[PDB]
Amino acid sequence: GAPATVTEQGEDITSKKDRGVLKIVKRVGNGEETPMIGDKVYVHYKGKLSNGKKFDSSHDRNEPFVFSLGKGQVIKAWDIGVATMKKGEIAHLLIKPEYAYGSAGSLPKIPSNATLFFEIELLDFKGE
Ligand SMILES: COc1cc2cc(OC)c1OCCOC[C@@H](C)OC(=O)[C@@H]1CCCCN1C(=O)[C@H]2C1CCCCC1
């Protein structure tokens, strides 16, 4: 499925090159600008645990998921990955635990040492 394709073909967008955050672009975006630290960012997304069935979607709540990039608000893999994306882009990210919720997890919702998969659409980003 989509996660395995990312394992197989995905680009390693980590600084350390440890395959901790793997990306495939699924719909190319517009322009060349990508968001900077501090930008207010608007996305839709569907996420799940790699092996298993906790699933989650922004669409479930009606509305975009909004956060400030690089400002502590999401897991490290999102600060890394969303920063590489363009307005209108859809991407797949596969994420090792070190860039998500770690050996601790976030129980009861997220287990210890969980790999995550997301599909992200970047709707917009605006300056602080
Ligand atoms: C660990 O707690 C949650 C995780 C998710 C969604 C949650 O609520 C909708 C959620 O509880 C509210 C806390 O805020 C989430 C922030 C830290 O989330 C993220 O950093 C990432 C990226 C941004 C979208 C949400 N995401 C998640 O990890 C989801 C998680 C994805 C895998 C399937 C289970 C939910």
Cα distance between residue 126 and residue 33, in whole Å: 11
**Does residue 49 have its Cβ closer than 6 Å to ligand 1?**
yes
Cα–Cα distance between 111 and 119 in angstroms, integer?
20
Angstrom distances, CA of residue 37 to CA of 25, 64, 128: 21, 19, 9
Decide if 6 contacts 88 (C-beta within 8 A).
Answer: no
Which atom of ligand 1 is the closest one to the Cα of 117?
Answer: 32
Ligand 1 neighbour 106 (Cβ under 6 A): yes
- Beta strands (DSSP E) in 1-128 are 11-12, 21-27, 40-49, 55-57, 65-68, 90-95, 116-126
d(CA 73, CA 8): 29
The structure's method of determination equals X-ray
| Beta-carbon contacts of residue 52 (< 8 Å; ≥ 6 apart) | none
- 39 included as an active-site residue: no
Torsion of CA 100, 39, 15, 10, to 10 degrees: 70
> Which one, of 7, 96, 109, 99, lies nearest residue 53 by Cα?
109
Number of H helices and number of E strands within the chain?
2, 7
How many whole angstroms separate alpha carbon 56 and alpha carbon 113? Answer: 18
| CA 27-28-31 angle, 5° bins | 145
Does the CB atom of residue 6 touch ligand 1 within 6 A?
A: no
Output the CA 73–ligand 1 centroid distance in Å. Answer: 10
Helices (H), the chain: 2-9, 76-83
d(CA 60, CA 5): 26
Residue type, 42: Y
Q: Domain locations in the chain?
A: 1-128
Q: How far apart are CA 74 and CA 59, in angstroms?
A: 18
Of 65, 101, 117, 125, catalytic: 101
